[PDB]
Enzyme design. Structure first.
Site, PDB file in Angstrom:
ATOM      1  N   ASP A  95      12.437 -12.364   3.783  1.00 16.40           N
ATOM      2  CA  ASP A  95      12.240 -12.910   5.119  1.00 16.40           C
ATOM      3  C   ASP A  95      12.518 -14.412   4.947  1.00 16.40           C
ATOM      4  O   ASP A  95      12.455 -14.931   3.830  1.00 16.40           O
ATOM      5  CB  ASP A  95      10.780 -12.656   5.532  1.00 16.40           C
ATOM      6  CG  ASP A  95      10.530 -12.794   7.014  1.00 16.40           C
ATOM      7  OD1 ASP A  95      10.540 -13.914   7.537  1.00 16.40           O
ATOM      8  OD2 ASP A  95      10.215 -11.786   7.655  1.00 16.40           O
ATOM      9  N   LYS A 169      13.491  -0.644  13.109  1.00 18.06           N
ATOM     10  CA  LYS A 169      12.858  -1.045  14.345  1.00 18.06           C
ATOM     11  C   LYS A 169      13.798  -0.547  15.447  1.00 18.06           C
ATOM     12  O   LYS A 169      15.020  -0.676  15.331  1.00 18.06           O
ATOM     13  CB  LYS A 169      12.816  -2.557  14.339  1.00 18.06           C
ATOM     14  CG  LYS A 169      12.079  -3.232  15.436  1.00 18.06           C
ATOM     15  CD  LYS A 169      12.536  -4.672  15.413  1.00 18.06           C
ATOM     16  CE  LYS A 169      11.546  -5.635  16.019  1.00 18.06           C
ATOM     17  NZ  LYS A 169      10.297  -5.768  15.225  1.00 18.06           N
ATOM     18  N   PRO A 173      17.401  -1.497  24.814  1.00 12.49           N
ATOM     19  CA  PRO A 173      17.491  -2.613  25.766  1.00 12.49           C
ATOM     20  C   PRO A 173      17.256  -2.081  27.192  1.00 12.49           C
ATOM     21  O   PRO A 173      17.408  -0.886  27.433  1.00 12.49           O
ATOM     22  CB  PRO A 173      18.932  -3.093  25.580  1.00 12.49           C
ATOM     23  CG  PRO A 173      19.196  -2.799  24.153  1.00 12.49           C
ATOM     24  CD  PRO A 173      18.618  -1.418  23.990  1.00 12.49           C
ATOM     25  N   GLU A 227      13.125   4.067  29.033  1.00 13.29           N
ATOM     26  CA  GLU A 227      12.248   3.254  29.869  1.00 13.29           C
ATOM     27  C   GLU A 227      11.223   4.067  30.658  1.00 13.29           C
ATOM     28  O   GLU A 227      10.054   3.699  30.746  1.00 13.29           O
ATOM     29  CB  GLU A 227      13.124   2.459  30.831  1.00 13.29           C
ATOM     30  CG  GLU A 227      12.393   1.644  31.857  1.00 13.29           C
ATOM     31  CD  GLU A 227      13.355   0.899  32.768  1.00 13.29           C
ATOM     32  OE1 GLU A 227      13.829   1.517  33.750  1.00 13.29           O
ATOM     33  OE2 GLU A 227      13.652  -0.286  32.485  1.00 13.29           O
TER      34      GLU A 227
END
Ligand SMILES: Nc1ncnc2c1ncn2[C@@H]1O[C@H](CSCC[C@H](N)C(=O)O)[C@@H](O)[C@H]1O
Ligand SMILES: Nc1ncnc2c1ncn2[C@@H]1O[C@H](CSCC[C@H](N)C(=O)O)[C@@H](O)[C@H]1O
Lengths: 291, 291
Positions: A95, A169, A173, A227
Site C-alpha cells: 500500500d 473489491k 458503478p 442497484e
C-alpha cells in the site's frame, strides 16, 4: 420491532430474490453502527475466502499478495488465525500508506510502502517466483471513471501475478453514471455482513484452474439490477431481526456473520456450531476492540 | 517422391502429433509455389469459418466486420458465395489501405479507409447497433512487440464490438524473442492450407455464448511448442503426396483443402463430395486466376 424467520441469509448476489427502487436519500442515512465496522467487514470476508481455499487445499504454501492493505489492523487477526492452525503462508502487504505497527516483526509478513503499477507488478512476480500466489485486492481511488480504472488495475494484477485464487473489491458503478461496459473476472459475488448501511459493495472470489481466465461483461442494465437488488437487501433485509435465530444478537448481519463463521476451522473442539461461532465472534470483537 | 497414405489431414493445432527442432535456414526457402497464394489461404479459412456459423444458424442477419481487409480481392468471392446461397449479410471492410475495385457498387458491402483505434471501434459499435456482429481480423503491423500490440488490438475489438463469433490472425511470437506472457481469446486453432511454406500462422475461431469471454494465457514454453509442432507440420507433413487421395492433385495442401471445402454448402447438387469439392476448387482457382 422488525421481526422475521429465516432459514439462511443471502450469501451471494445471485441469491437476492427481490429488488427495490434506489432512494438517493438513503445516502444521508447512518452508514455505520459499530466501531471499527470496516475492519470487521474485511476480516469476515477474508476469513471466509481463505478458509475456502484451505478447504480446497490451496492455501498452504501460498504467498498472499494483499494490495490496498493499509492500515491492515484486521489482517493481524487473519495472519494469527492461520499461523496458529499450522498453515504455512507468507504475507506481502503493499500500500502507499503505512500499516498498523502490530504487523511489524513477523518473519512471515512483508510490508511494502509502494503504490503499485503494472511494471511493479511484473517485478514482484519475478521476485515471488516460483511461489503460488493468492491475490487480495482492496485498492481505492469515487467517480465511475475511478471505479473503471480500479477494475482495470485489478484485472492486470491477475494477468501479471497469475494467482491461484483472488478476492477482489467489487461495486458496480451507478447506471445513471455509466461510461462504458467492461469486464470483471468470473467469480462468486460474496455479500458482506457489516458493510456500510447502503453499500452495494461485495467481494469477487475466484479460483483459477488451468491456464484459462474467464471474464464477464458488465453493462448498464446489469448496473440497474445491482442497484435494485442491493438496495432491497440494504433497506429491507439487513434491517430484519431474525427471531428464530437463537443467538445473543439476532439482527440480520449477525445471522449473516454466523453463516460465514461456521465455515472457519479451529484447533479447539466445540460441542456445537453455535459454540464455535460465539467463540470466533467473541474473539474477533475482542481483537478489534468492538464492545 | 515423398508418398504416404493418410486418413485425414490435421485440421487443428491440437491434432499435430509430432514436433521438430526449428531450423532457421528454413526462412530462406521458397515461401510460395502458387500465384495469389495468400488470397487463396484467406479465402479457404474464411469460407470454412463462415460455413460453420451458417451451420450453427448465426450467420444470417449478421454484419461481418472485417478489419485488415485490403486489398480484399478474395472477399468478393466470399460475399458472392453467401449472397447466392440466400444468406442475408452486411459486410463492413475497414483498412487504411484501399480495397480492390471489384468490391465497389454492392449495396451489402461498405468499404472504410481508416486505421482503427479503440475510439473508432466504439463509434462503429454505436452505429452498427443493434446488429449482431461477426468479426474477422487480419490486421498487420514484425517484432514480438508488434505482434503483442496486434493481439492487444484484437482483444479490444472483441470487448468493444462484442461479436457473436470471431476469426483472428494468430501466430505465436518466437520463444527466443519472448517479451512477456499474454492472453488470447479461447477458440479453435484452425490450420491453414496454402499458408507460406514455413509459416506458423493459424486462425483463432471463436463463438461467443452468454456474456462471458474466456481467455487463455500464452507463455514462452507454449511458444516453444508452437514452433516445434508447426515446424514439423511444415517441413514433414506439408511436403507429403497423399497417394491414397484420389484427386487431381494429391499434395498435402490439396488434401487439406478438400476437408475444408467438403463443409461448404452449395445450391447445386452433386453425386459425391469429391464432385462438390472439385467444383468449389475449380471455381475458386478460376476466380483468383490461379492455373
Ligand atoms: N496502486 C495502489 N497500490 C497500493 N495500494 C493502493 C493503490 N491505490 C490505492 N491503494 C490503497 O487502497 C487502500 C484502500 S483502503 C484499504 C484498507 C485495507 N484493505 C485494510 O486492510 O485496512 C488505501 O490504503 C490506498 O493507499
Ligand atoms: N488499425 C488498422 N485498421 C485497419 N486495417 C489495419 C490496421 N492496421 C493494419 N491494418 C491492415 O492490416 C492489413 C494486413 S494484410 C490483410 C489482407 C486482407 N486480409 C485481404 O483480404 O486481402 C493491411 O491492409 C493493413 O493496412
Amino acid at each position: 420491532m422488525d421481526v422475521v424467520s429465516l432459514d439462511k441469509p443471502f450469501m451471494y448476489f445471485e441469491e437476492i430474490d427481490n429488488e427495490l427502487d434506489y432512494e438517493p436519500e438513503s445516502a444521508n442515512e447512518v452508514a455505520k453502527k459499530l466501531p471499527y465496522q470496516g475492519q470487521l467487514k474485511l476480516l469476515l470476508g477474508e476469513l471466509f475466502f481463505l478458509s475456502k481455499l484451505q478447504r480446497h487445499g490451496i492455501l498452504d504454501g501460498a504467498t498472499v499478495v494483499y494490495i490496498g492493505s493499509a492500515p491492515g489492523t484486521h489482517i493481524r487477526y487473519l495472519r494469527d488465525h492461520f499461523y496458529n492452525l499450522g498453515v504455512i503462508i507468507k504475507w506481502m502487504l503493499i500500500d502507499g500508506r503505512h500499516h498498523d505497527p502490530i504487523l511489524n516483526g513477523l518473519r512471515d509478513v512483508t510490508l511494502v510502502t509502494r503504490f503499485v503499477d503494472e511494471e511493479y507488478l511484473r517485478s514482484i512476480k519475478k521476485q515471488l517466483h516460483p511461489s503460488k500466489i493468492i491475490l487480495i485486492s482492496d485498492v481505492r481511488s469515487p467517480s465511475t471513471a475511478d471505479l473503471l480504472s480500479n477494475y482495470a488495475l485489478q484485472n492486470v494484477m491477475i494477468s501479471i501475478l497469475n494467482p491461484v485464487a483472488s478476492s477482489l473489491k467489487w461495486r458496480c458503478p451507478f447506471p445513471d453514471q455509466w461510461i462504458k461496459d467492461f469486464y470483471i473476472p468470473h467469480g462468486n459475488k460474496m455479500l458482506q455482513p457489516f458493510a456500510p448501511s447502503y453499500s452495494a459493495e461485495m467481494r469477487l472470489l475466484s479460483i483459477y484452474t488451468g491456464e484459462n481466465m474467464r471474464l464477464t461483461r458488465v453493462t448498464k442494465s446489469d448496473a440497474v439490477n445491482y442497484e435494485k437488488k442491493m438496495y432491497y437487501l440494504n433497506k429491507i433485509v439487513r434491517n430484519k431481526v431474525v427471531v428464530n435465530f437463537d443467538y445473543p444478537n439476532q439482527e440480520y448481519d449477525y445471522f449473516h456473520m454466523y453463516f460465514m463463521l461456521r465455515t472457519v476451522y479451529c484447533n479447539k473442539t466445540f460441542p456445537t456450531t453455535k459454540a464455535k461461532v460465539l467463540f470466533l465472534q467473541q474473539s474477533i470483537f475482542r481483537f478489534l476492540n468492538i464492545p
